[model samples]
Target chain A: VDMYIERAGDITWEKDAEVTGNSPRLDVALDESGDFSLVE
Target chain B: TTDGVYRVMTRLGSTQVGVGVMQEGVFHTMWHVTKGAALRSGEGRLDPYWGDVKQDLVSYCGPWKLDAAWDGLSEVQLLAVPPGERAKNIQTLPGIFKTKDGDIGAVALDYPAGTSGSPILDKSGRVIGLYGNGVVISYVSAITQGKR
Candidate 1:
């Protein structure tokens, strides 16, 4: 599973990819299901 | 444990934030902002008080150019000397001043030892200079009732 966070103004990601130890999800969607999550 | 029972996890969070302009020259900038608001409010009362004074008088002199013509003159000096003396001692001296565009023109003259003088508004009713305490001074704007 994948997740995303958003707020007002601007923000940047600290890490490029990979949620924890490895890349578990191939494609991720943002603001699609009222919460950032991955679907297959 | 999940065969017949379930566990729900939830977290509550709260945060606060605030933003404001920098405070390097807060008082000065605040005054400007307040003045702008006052102007917009449309009371047509630019001069809130009888003798409203601006604190940034030094900026009127200009930047980096030290030794202004009326640098050290005080309120007392501004109203002491007669018109002729001010004209001769301050206005007529060319060498004492370097040619800068938009110089002072006329000024008000008041009595010493007491406040018993009328607003010596010039023919144009614009105060250009003043004299007292062995010194004469001038300003960009016409002299009003109170200090510059």
Candidate 2:
């Protein structure tokens, strides 16, 4: 579906899509030791 | 998920999942707690906040280069789920970006609560920037400081 969206400079149509397909998911978590880890 | 868009869990033991974008293999997001704080990786330089944002579970979507010129009304897509849904419940929303003085200020779109770190993509499906607070978008330049 298409809808109207306005901004400071101009207005345009927003084309919305409901994608059922799965996109890759990644996580950036903080460990208990006050550090970060990249978890799959 | 080769889209380079990711569902972010910034803190441990929290069910909240925010959005994150992968740029050149480094993760970028506004929901990250480490925003403005430097990480141990790389140079350990101060990280840029909201205006900025990692990990190894699986190689995330291929690295996406930032779109320097964010033209007004440029069509963009957000890979995120609506609030109160699972992180993997991703949807692509149609939207347009607004800019001032070459900086991305806001976006004309409705996004999920955790959509803050979601990648804002141009029509060509390239990473333009990461979503900031309500309607806010930080330039891809924000994440260039500490590339891990």
Candidate 3:
């Protein structure tokens, strides 16, 4: 089944999971060099 | 489908813990009641929800703590996010956290349905699933009724 995550105003977070574990409740942003910025 | 009905997590296991979402300028959050305990000794609090299922509050880190952790992480510039703009579809490691108010069960609901506490963090250690919703909704419903 699909476990959706979050929604802010009109924004929504969806998750592809079977059960539940160490998955986040929000989103993330990555940089061009394959680096990271915000991973929440 | 439990759509629109998010979730809350505890050390024992995660269950449906939050009520709804509340947002401000650049922050959003959710919360659980301050009344349940998973301890074998039956140690817990009295919550207004579940009709006394011994539901305790699930406490997460605060904005300051999350921000510090994020800064300490990768070295990349943050994108300009709007008031309600935040990430989604990500995964996180559910961990335990102790706060100034003792162990906040696996979750929390301290404000009786008006104000909220405890801001859940995300995988990147950013402030994410971090606010109480049910109480906020109750508060809003009541206040709006009064105002109208």
Candidate 4:
């Protein structure tokens, strides 16, 4: 599944997300120098 | 049209409330309405929509008087919705406001803290502004100029 976060007009902001699963999952860095980790 | 307004609620073991409006399949509200609440609660949800239940407004008439007041008319006469009991009732909140430089309007009515993101509808139920801090309303036209 995919997710999206939106802001209103002319305003810029930063977003970061953490994705995890019971089995295995991949992390995609949506922003520069952004990273995520998975845990039990 | 009139059906687009909604009461936005998010839960973090408790409920945090706000208001929003649906326009062209997209739900519009304040940045803070779901800011941390949604992240804490919807960690794994994929659907973009929120607010499970729809809270509808039956009708309103008070904005018309305000409109007439601005239309070169004074001392308006209009009927208002009768006060309804709390938890199972409704009342007409007639607001008079003036917009400032950033198109933010200062509304005279006192809305609760969680009322941020409430849509300020005109007499025709057209969404005009987004209610923000201290009941100030920002222009909804801001949404049309960008990618959000």
Q: Which has the greatest DockQ?
A: 3
Cα deviation of B34 in candidate 3 (Å)? 5.3
* lDDT at A8, model 2: 14
**On a 0 to 1 TM-score scale, where does candidate 2 land against the true structure?**
0.43
Sorted into a CAPRI-style docking class, model 3 comes out as incorrect
**Tens-digit lDDT track for model 3 on B62-141?**
12111222222222111112223232332223322222322211121222231232333333433333333322211211
Candidate 3 residue spans exceeding 4 A from truth? A1-40, B1-15, B19-31, B39-124, B133-148
Candidate 4: stretches off by over 4 Å:
A1-40, B1-3, B36-103, B135-148
Candidate 3 chain B, run of 10 with poorest lDDT: B139-148
Candidate 1 lDDT at B124 equals 29
Would you list the clashing residue pairs of candidate 2? A24-B1, A38-B55, A38-B56, A39-B57, A40-B57, A40-B58, B19-B117
Classify candidate 2 by CAPRI docking class. incorrect
Per-prediction TM-score, chain B alone: 0.19, 0.50, 0.20, 0.45
lDDT of 4 by residue, B54-116 (tens): 111211111111111112111111111111211111112233322222222223334354555
Q: After superposition, how far is residue B61 of candidate 2 from its true place, in Å?
A: 15
| Tens digits of lDDT, candidate 2, B40-140 | 22233223333322311111223334544344443344444333554332233233222221222234444545555555455655555555443122221
Best by lDDT: 2
Indicate whether candidate 3 or candidate 4 has the larger lDDT.
Answer: 4
lDDT of 4 at B66: 13
